[PDB]
Protein backbone atom coordinates (compact mmCIF):
# COMPACT_ATOMS: atom_id res chain seq x y z
CA UNK A 1 0.00 0.00 0.00
CA UNK A 2 2.46 2.63 -1.22
CA UNK A 3 4.89 1.55 1.51
CA UNK A 4 7.90 2.41 -0.68
CA UNK A 5 9.03 5.44 1.35
CA UNK A 6 8.48 3.67 4.68
CA UNK A 7 10.72 0.73 3.74
CA UNK A 8 13.40 3.08 2.39
CA UNK A 9 13.24 5.08 5.62
CA UNK A 10 13.93 1.90 7.59
CA UNK A 11 16.54 0.46 5.21
CA UNK A 12 18.39 3.78 5.00
CA UNK A 13 18.20 4.49 8.72
CA UNK A 14 19.92 1.16 9.41
CA UNK A 15 22.47 1.63 6.63
CA UNK A 16 23.40 5.16 7.62
CA UNK A 17 23.97 4.11 11.24
CA UNK A 18 26.40 1.42 10.14
CA UNK A 19 27.99 3.88 7.68
CA UNK A 20 28.59 6.53 10.38
CA UNK A 21 30.28 4.01 12.69
CA UNK A 22 32.56 2.79 9.90
CA UNK A 23 33.44 6.34 8.82
CA UNK A 24 34.43 7.25 12.39
CA UNK A 25 36.62 4.13 12.53
CA UNK A 26 38.31 4.58 9.13
CA UNK A 27 38.90 8.31 9.66
CA UNK A 28 40.26 7.75 13.17
CA UNK A 29 37.92 10.22 14.88
CA UNK A 30 38.02 7.85 17.88
CA UNK A 31 40.63 5.25 18.98
CA UNK A 32 40.29 1.77 17.47
CA UNK A 33 39.95 0.58 21.05
CA UNK A 34 36.27 1.57 21.25
CA UNK A 35 35.35 -0.33 18.09
CA UNK A 36 34.37 -3.96 17.78
CA UNK A 37 34.02 -5.96 14.58
CA UNK A 38 30.44 -6.89 13.73
CA UNK A 39 28.69 -8.49 10.75
CA UNK A 40 26.59 -6.11 8.63
CA UNK A 41 25.44 -6.63 5.04
CA UNK A 42 27.34 -9.92 5.22
CA UNK A 43 30.56 -7.95 5.55
CA UNK A 44 32.88 -7.26 8.52
CA UNK A 45 32.26 -3.77 9.91
CA UNK A 46 33.58 -1.86 12.93
CA UNK A 47 30.93 -0.67 15.39
CA UNK A 48 31.55 1.49 18.46
CA UNK A 49 31.01 -0.06 21.91
CA UNK A 50 30.47 3.26 23.69
CA UNK A 51 26.79 3.66 24.77
CA UNK A 52 26.68 7.47 24.68
CA UNK A 53 28.21 7.67 21.20
CA UNK A 54 25.93 4.87 20.03
CA UNK A 55 22.81 6.56 21.40
CA UNK A 56 23.86 9.86 19.83
CA UNK A 57 24.14 8.27 16.38
CA UNK A 58 20.86 6.40 16.86
CA UNK A 59 18.97 9.56 17.92
CA UNK A 60 20.42 11.44 14.97
CA UNK A 61 19.21 8.95 12.39
CA UNK A 62 15.93 8.41 14.25
CA UNK A 63 15.01 12.03 13.55
CA UNK A 64 15.88 11.72 9.86
CA UNK A 65 13.66 8.71 9.21
CA UNK A 66 10.40 10.72 9.15
CA UNK A 67 11.90 13.17 6.65
CA UNK A 68 12.99 10.23 4.51
CA UNK A 69 9.43 8.85 4.71
CA UNK A 70 8.13 12.06 3.14
CA UNK A 71 11.05 12.12 0.70
CA UNK A 72 12.14 15.58 1.84
CA UNK A 73 15.83 14.63 2.18
CA UNK A 74 18.21 15.70 -0.59
CA UNK A 75 21.43 14.68 1.21
CA UNK A 76 22.68 13.20 4.48
CA UNK A 77 26.23 14.38 5.14
CA UNK A 78 28.69 12.98 7.67
CA UNK A 79 31.04 15.87 8.40
CA UNK A 80 34.43 15.66 10.06
CA UNK A 81 35.37 18.99 11.69
CA UNK A 82 38.83 20.10 12.81
CA UNK A 83 39.66 21.80 16.14
CA UNK A 84 38.55 25.12 14.64
CA UNK A 85 35.12 23.64 13.93
CA UNK A 86 35.67 23.83 10.16
CA UNK A 87 34.92 20.91 7.77
CA UNK A 88 37.99 18.82 6.91
CA UNK A 89 36.15 15.98 5.15
CA UNK A 90 32.55 15.44 4.04
CA UNK A 91 30.96 12.08 3.23
CA UNK A 92 28.02 13.06 1.06
CA UNK A 93 25.11 10.65 0.56
CA UNK A 94 22.87 12.21 -2.15
CA UNK A 95 19.46 10.54 -2.15
CA UNK A 96 16.65 10.32 -4.72
CA UNK A 97 13.44 8.33 -4.33
CA UNK A 98 11.19 7.06 -7.16
CA UNK A 99 7.45 7.63 -7.09
CA UNK A 100 5.71 5.62 -4.37
CA UNK A 101 4.92 2.00 -5.05
CA UNK A 102 3.76 -1.05 -3.14
CA UNK A 103 6.71 -3.30 -2.32
CA UNK A 104 6.66 -7.02 -1.49
CA UNK A 105 9.31 -8.09 1.03
CA UNK A 106 11.20 -10.74 -0.95
CA UNK A 107 13.92 -10.19 -3.55
CA UNK A 108 13.76 -6.39 -3.87
CA UNK A 109 14.75 -5.97 -0.22
CA UNK A 110 17.75 -8.29 -0.60
CA UNK A 111 18.69 -6.62 -3.89
CA UNK A 112 18.86 -3.23 -2.20
CA UNK A 113 20.97 -4.71 0.60
CA UNK A 114 23.43 -6.16 -1.93
CA UNK A 115 23.78 -2.72 -3.55
CA UNK A 116 24.31 -1.01 -0.18
CA UNK A 117 27.10 -3.46 0.63
CA UNK A 118 29.24 -1.92 -2.11
CA UNK A 119 29.06 1.43 -0.25
CA UNK A 120 30.26 -0.19 2.98
CA UNK A 121 33.13 -1.82 1.12
CA UNK A 122 34.20 1.48 -0.44
CA UNK A 123 34.06 3.39 2.87
CA UNK A 124 36.25 0.68 4.45
CA UNK A 125 39.17 1.44 2.11
CA UNK A 126 38.84 5.21 1.91
CA UNK A 127 41.87 5.71 4.16
CA UNK A 128 43.95 4.55 1.17
CA UNK A 129 43.04 7.60 -0.92
CA UNK A 130 42.52 10.23 1.80
CA UNK A 131 45.30 12.04 3.68
CA UNK A 132 45.11 11.54 7.47
CA UNK A 133 43.11 14.15 9.38
CA UNK A 134 44.84 16.52 11.83
CA UNK A 135 44.43 15.63 15.53
CA UNK A 136 41.41 17.01 17.38
CA UNK A 137 38.65 16.34 14.87
CA UNK A 138 35.00 15.85 15.86
CA UNK A 139 31.95 15.04 13.74
CA UNK A 140 28.34 15.94 13.02
CA UNK A 141 25.60 14.96 10.61
CA UNK A 142 24.02 17.45 8.25
CA UNK A 143 20.66 16.92 6.55
CA UNK A 144 19.96 18.79 3.30
CA UNK A 145 16.23 19.11 2.62
CA UNK A 146 14.71 19.70 -0.82
CA UNK A 147 12.63 22.60 0.52
CA UNK A 148 13.47 25.26 3.10
CA UNK A 149 14.59 23.46 6.27
CA UNK A 150 12.31 25.89 8.10
CA UNK A 151 9.35 23.78 6.95
CA UNK A 152 11.10 20.61 8.10
CA UNK A 153 12.48 22.34 11.20
CA UNK A 154 9.51 20.92 13.10
CA UNK A 155 9.17 17.57 11.33
CA UNK A 156 12.72 16.66 12.36
CA UNK A 157 12.14 17.48 16.04
CA UNK A 158 11.22 13.81 16.49
CA UNK A 159 12.97 13.51 19.84
CA UNK A 160 12.87 15.77 22.89
CA UNK A 161 16.23 16.34 24.58
CA UNK A 162 17.67 15.94 21.06
CA UNK A 163 16.88 19.19 19.21
CA UNK A 164 17.95 20.06 15.66
CA UNK A 165 18.78 23.47 14.23
CA UNK A 166 19.72 25.18 10.99
CA UNK A 167 23.43 24.88 10.19
CA UNK A 168 25.84 27.76 9.58
CA UNK A 169 27.83 28.57 6.43
CA UNK A 170 31.19 27.66 7.99
CA UNK A 171 29.88 24.27 9.10
CA UNK A 172 29.46 23.56 5.38
CA UNK A 173 31.92 25.75 3.46
CA UNK A 174 35.08 24.18 2.02
CA UNK A 175 37.75 25.72 -0.20
CA UNK A 176 37.86 23.80 -3.48
CA UNK A 177 38.07 20.83 -2.17
CA UNK A 178 39.24 17.44 -3.48
CA UNK A 179 36.30 15.34 -4.70
CA UNK A 180 36.38 11.55 -4.44
CA UNK A 181 33.54 9.46 -5.85
CA UNK A 182 32.92 6.24 -3.92
CA UNK A 183 29.78 4.56 -5.25
CA UNK A 184 26.44 5.07 -6.98
CA UNK A 185 23.42 2.77 -6.96
CA UNK A 186 20.02 2.56 -8.63
CA UNK A 187 17.03 0.46 -7.62
CA UNK A 188 13.22 0.47 -7.62
CA UNK A 189 12.95 2.27 -4.28
CA UNK A 190 16.19 4.23 -4.03
CA UNK A 191 18.86 5.96 -6.09
CA UNK A 192 21.92 7.06 -4.14
CA UNK A 193 25.47 8.21 -4.65
CA UNK A 194 28.25 8.64 -2.13
CA UNK A 195 31.29 10.82 -2.63
CA UNK A 196 33.77 12.48 -0.34
CA UNK A 197 34.82 16.11 -0.28
CA UNK A 198 38.28 16.40 1.24
CA UNK A 199 40.18 19.52 2.36
CA UNK A 200 43.05 20.06 -0.08
CA UNK A 201 45.73 20.71 2.54
CA UNK A 202 45.29 19.15 5.98
CA UNK A 203 48.75 20.27 7.12
Amino acid sequence: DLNSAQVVADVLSEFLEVAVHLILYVREVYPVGIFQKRKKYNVPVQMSCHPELNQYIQDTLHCVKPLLEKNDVEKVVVVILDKEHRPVEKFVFEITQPPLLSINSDSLLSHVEQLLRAFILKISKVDKVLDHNPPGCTFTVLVHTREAATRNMEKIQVIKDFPWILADEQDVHMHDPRLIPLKTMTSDILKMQLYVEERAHKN
Partner: peptide, 21 residues
Protein backbone atom coordinates in the same frame (compact mmCIF):
# COMPACT_ATOMS: atom_id res chain seq x y z
CA UNK B 1 18.32 27.59 5.15
CA UNK B 2 17.81 24.01 3.95
CA UNK B 3 20.58 22.30 5.92
CA UNK B 4 19.74 20.93 9.36
CA UNK B 5 22.18 19.85 12.08
CA UNK B 6 21.79 18.38 15.59
CA UNK B 7 22.02 20.87 18.46
CA UNK B 8 23.96 18.51 20.71
CA UNK B 9 27.53 17.47 20.00
CA UNK B 10 28.61 13.83 20.07
CA UNK B 11 30.82 12.70 22.95
CA UNK B 12 34.43 13.88 22.48
CA UNK B 13 37.49 11.71 21.86
CA UNK B 14 38.52 12.70 25.40
CA UNK B 15 35.31 11.34 26.93
CA UNK B 16 35.85 8.19 24.88
CA UNK B 17 39.44 7.80 26.05
CA UNK B 18 38.31 8.38 29.63
CA UNK B 19 36.14 5.25 29.38
CA UNK B 20 38.83 3.12 27.73
CA UNK B 21 41.11 3.83 30.70
Amino acid sequence: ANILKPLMSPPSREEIMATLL
